[PDB]
């Protein structure tokens, strides 16, 4: 008896490079026998020039998912392990590039000058390494910066239906950073990573063109896992974006990551898991699908001064089905993120674009993510819109309604018009402080509701061209000072006499 135990121990202890061989291949998985010293997440290489992740290790075989060109695999192929866990090149050379989730260039331009390499799975900064999120990530969307502010270090979910403006809100957010990038100050200068997961290739080309048309390719990287690429690339794309971002964050740069969409990150990881015969849970997702998104998103942080005081801001996007925010993946990412810009398709059709459903949308960071001028101007805005959202049932009885609340109903209608905004037109904070000021201080109150968007645009064009000192003051001091306020009220009443409405009436 005892001799068999000693001999089995010596056999297992008995375990140049190690070789495996493929024994099964199907559907993007290849089971490899051998590789006794393989580690979980190790990059395997197959003889056609193909890679796999060794994501599952059994008693006699290694369940490796395959990252591309999977048709080239066969039973009996010699598999070599590389000595390394999943890792990606990083550096400033990625700015303006499109890359696959292995950091290889896919835009067809020259090969990227890799500054360093990072493992895909290094730990997130612990509670002792972080700092409070005390400075703004200006999105340039009036319905976000005034009501659900994002601070650099926050994780803000752009949850909504299909075709509701989620990609457009994030592309406005990435375009808005140009006015900070042009000042060569690394403390203002936000960088961006747009991680496209399971987009079609032409959609990523449309987003690249929309960013080039606004100069954002000076400082934006795209990580592209187009739907052509294997489930293993759609699964790694967010971690490749997060590793490229984390290199800049740990150097003390400020980063914005957009994950578009984390719903297709989860649907690729479900595919890989179910093919690996891992036990399915709710909605067929594996047990660790929460841990997939939490270990992805929690790597977005603001660091302490001892780690250079960099930060990474996550804007995950998710596509809910029929507005069901109570589905599994929505419920996960709603519990992981710091706020939720609920986009809705009825508000989108009612003309309310960007379609943010304020009063269910929330930011848990709150006022700490706003400049003082924005807090003083917009603090009342949520109260005026909650009062209007109660009173809209009385829009048929505006004559019978009490005058004190009639002046809340017409105000709310002019604030809802004020929060509308055309795509690829992000406002600098200096301009949307003045836009929200027009509303909450009641200068719009005499403008007809249908003319409000043209009144706002023509006022900001007038103030920008002739009264730049109002914007310069707000920008350089972060406060709408009393002397700048009194001059702003004066120029609003100067302009408002030359404005002409749809009916051709006067104003005030």
């Amino acid at each position: 008896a005892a001799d068999i135990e000693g001999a089995i121990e010596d056999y297992v202890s008995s375990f140049r490079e190690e070789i495996g061989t493929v024994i099964d291949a199907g559907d993007g998985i290849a089971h490899v026998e051998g590789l006794p010293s393989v580690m979980t997440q190790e990059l395997l290489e197959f003889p056609g020039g193909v890679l796999g992740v060794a994501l599952n290790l059994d008693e006699h075989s290694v369940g490796a998912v395959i990252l591309g060109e999977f048709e080239k695999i066969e039973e009996g192929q010699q598999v070599k392990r590389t000595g390394e866990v999943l890792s990606v090149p990083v550096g400033d050379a990625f700015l303006g590039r499109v890359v696959n989730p292995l950091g290889q260039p896919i835009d067809g331009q020259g090969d990227i000058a890799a500054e360093t390499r990072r493992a895909l799975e290094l730990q997130a900064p612990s509670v002792v390494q972080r700092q409070s999120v005390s400075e703004p990530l200006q999105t340039g969307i009036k319905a976000i910066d005034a009501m659900t502010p994002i601070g650099r270090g926050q994780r803000q979910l752009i949850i909504g239906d299909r075709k509701t403006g989620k990609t457009a809100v994030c592309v406005d957010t990435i375009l808005n950073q140009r006015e900070a990038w042009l000042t060569g100050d690394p403390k203002q200068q936000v960088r961006c990573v747009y991680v496209a997961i399971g987009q079609k290739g032409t959609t990523i080309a449309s987003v690249k063109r929309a960013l080039e048309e606004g100069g954002a390719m000076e400082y934006t990287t795209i990580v592209a896992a187009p739907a052509s690429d294997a489930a293993g690339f759609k699964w790694l794309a967010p971690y490749t974006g997060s590793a490229i971002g984390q290199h800049w964050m740990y150097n003390g740069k400020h980063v914005l990551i957009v994950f578009d969409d984390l719903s297709k990150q989860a649907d690729a990881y479900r595919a890989i898991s179910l093919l690996l015969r891992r036990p399915p849970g709710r909605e067929a997702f594996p047990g660790d699908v929460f841990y997939l998104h939490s270990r992805l998103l929690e790597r977005c942080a603001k660091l302490s001064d001892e780690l250079g005081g960099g930060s990474m801001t996550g804007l995950p996007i998710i596509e809910t089905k029929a507005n069901d925010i109570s589905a599994f993946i929505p419920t996960n990412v709603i519990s992981i993120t710091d706020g939720q810009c609920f986009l809705e398709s009825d508000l989108f059709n009612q003309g309310v674009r960007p379609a943010i459903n304020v009063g269910v949308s929330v930011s848990r960071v709150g006022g700490a993510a706003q400049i003082k001028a924005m807090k003083e101007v917009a603090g009342s805005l949520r109260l005026d819109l909650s009062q209007y959202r109660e009173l809209e049932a009385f829009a048929a009885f505006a004559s019978d309604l009490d005058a004190a609340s009639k002046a809340q109903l017409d105000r709310g209608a002019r604030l809802v018009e004020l929060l509308k905004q055309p795509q690829y037109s992000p406002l600098a904070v200096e301009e949307q402080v003045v836009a929200i000021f027009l509303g909450t201080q009641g200068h719009l109150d005499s403008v007809p509701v249908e003319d409000v968007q043209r009144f706002e645009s023509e006022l900001l064009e007038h103030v920008k061209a002739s009264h730049s000192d109002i914007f310069d003051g707000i920008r350089e001091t972060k406060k709408l000072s009393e002397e700048a306020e009194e001059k702003l009220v004066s120029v609003i009443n100067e302009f408002k006499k030359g404005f002409q409405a749809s009916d051709g009436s006067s104003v005030v």
Partner: protein, 464 residues
């Protein structure tokens, strides 16, 4: 040297080979059936390697009459289909055999069914508007010439009548080449297309590939890739602009779901295969058009149980530039073509590309129809006279806009008796710009129903 069948279980066949002779993934294997009227050569595609020199295969033709231990020979290459100018004006099955004249394609260049999609370097976004002359399409869902268009809809909501109308509008004047894929579509409508294209003489430029729903899951999968690899020949090797119609593209992923359990994949959410977004992506990405060479895809997508939350519709929606979106709610009101004006969408519908005069009008129509759907719950219970004069006026405009989005289609000659109509885009915008500003509230509500533009609206209103 050759292999042998080991196990047979519906359309899935396991085949064992000698140690050195295992075929690569997606090779075609030939096996002979030798009983009576079933006697045929059978084509199997290698779906997996099981280990022990076994491969699991999906049969392109019914496995009835197949015997355990019959010989199986590998073709050495993937399934391949004829490509060239000479495939235009013929009908083929998924294997690339001509239905009309057996053996016709055997001297052509044959291309493998499987290939990679074009590289991301080769892609550019398409912004040319396609004019179809359908009011609802040209107003609310403007199509992209070279884009990936779709006609979503539940069972029976008229998708195949709308796609046959879209063939008749686009491919009739179109100066390039057209392909039609029949993926699990009803064979009756495959024949009514075939004789209609022969009568209109369009058949001389159209290649049809049919893998209709009487065929096993192997061919309902590989037919979409076969028709697509004829379109990819016309795109790449000839540079002549292509139309690619696909009815019904859902049947590709459905047939994948039917084999997946026999392939030993575990079932995902609502019983799809787990590979769904990787199968569908690996098909849909090939349908894109690279710079300098357009493919105008037009693919009808079935929606199981009318549930637009169903994973197959929900995954397909990512791959598309203009999604017309049919519904049983609008169909049950007789508003054939049954296009849902609020669900349906297009990426080209922006004021940079279509112009502000189109964009404003499309947005005012969507805002009115959206306020009307917000008001239908109140109108059903409290009743129209309860409402504000502004809301009640908007309802009397929305009820007219709903009907004026319906149109007498040329494919619906049999549904309506009256001949079909084409409404120019300029007349469509003028008519809806009038309607949204109330310029027709004096006309009876019925006068807008099924009518081809303003000249016909006037002639119908004065007929009532």
């Amino acid at each position: 040297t050759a292999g042998r069948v080991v196990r047979i279980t519906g359309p899935v066949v396991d085949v064992e080979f000698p140690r050195g002779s295992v075929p690569e993934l997606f090779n075609a294997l030939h096996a002979e059936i030798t009983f009576g009227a079933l006697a045929k050569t059978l084509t199997l595609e290698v779906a997996q390697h099981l280990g022990d020199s076994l491969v699991r295969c999906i049969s392109m033709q019914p496995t009835d009459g197949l015997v355990r231990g019959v010989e199986v020979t590998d073709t050495g290459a993937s399934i391949s289909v004829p490509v060239g100018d000479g495939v235009k004006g013929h009908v083929f099955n998924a294997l690339g055999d001509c239905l009309d004249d057996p053996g016709y394609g055997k001297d052509f260049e044959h291309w493998s069914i499987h290939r990679k999609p074009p590289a991301f370097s080769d892609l550019e976004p398409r912004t040319e508007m396609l004019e179809t002359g359908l009011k609802v399409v040209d107003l609310l869902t403007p199509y992209v010439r070279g884009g990936k268009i779709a006609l979503f809809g539940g069972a029976g909501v008229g998708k195949t009548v709308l796609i046959q109308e879209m063939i008749n509008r686009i491919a009739r004047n179109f100066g390039g080449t057209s392909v039609f894929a029949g993926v699990g579509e009803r064979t009756r409508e495959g024949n009514d297309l075939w004789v209609e294209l022969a009568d209109a003489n369009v058949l001389k430029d159209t290649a049809l590939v049919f893998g209709q729903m009487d065929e096993p899951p192997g061919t309902r999968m590989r037919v979409a890739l076969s028709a697509l690899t004829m379109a990819e020949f016309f795109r790449d090797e000839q540079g002549q602009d292509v139309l690619l119609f696909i009815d019904n593209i859902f049947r590709f992923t459905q047939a994948g779901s039917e084999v997946s359990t026999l392939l030993g994949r575990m079932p995902s959410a609502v019983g799809y295969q787990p590979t769904l977004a990787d199968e569908m992506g690996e098909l849909q990405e090939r349908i894109t058009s690279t710079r300098g060479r357009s493919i105008t895809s037009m693919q009808a997508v079935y929606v199981p149980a009318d549930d637009y939350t169903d994973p197959a519709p929900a995954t397909t929606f990512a791959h598309l530039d203009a999604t017309t979106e049919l519904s049983r709610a609008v169909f049950s009101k007789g508003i054939f073509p049954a296009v849902d004006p609020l669900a349906s969408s297009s990426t080209i519908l922006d004021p940079a590309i279509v112009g502000d005069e189109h964009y404003r009008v499309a947005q005012e129509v969507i805002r009115i129809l959206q306020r009307y759907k917000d008001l239908q719950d109140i109108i059903a219970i409290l009743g129209i006279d309860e409402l504000s004069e502004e809301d009640k006026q908007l309802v009397n405009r929305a009820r007219r806009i709903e009907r004026f989005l319906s149109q007498n289609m040329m494919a619906a000659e049999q549904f309506t008796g009256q001949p079909g109509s084409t409404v120019p885009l300029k007349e469509t915008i003028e008519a809806f710009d009038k309607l949204t500003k109330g310029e027709f509230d004096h006309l009876p509500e019925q006068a807008f129903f099924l009518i081809g533009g303003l000249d016909d609206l006037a002639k119908k209103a004065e007929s009532l």
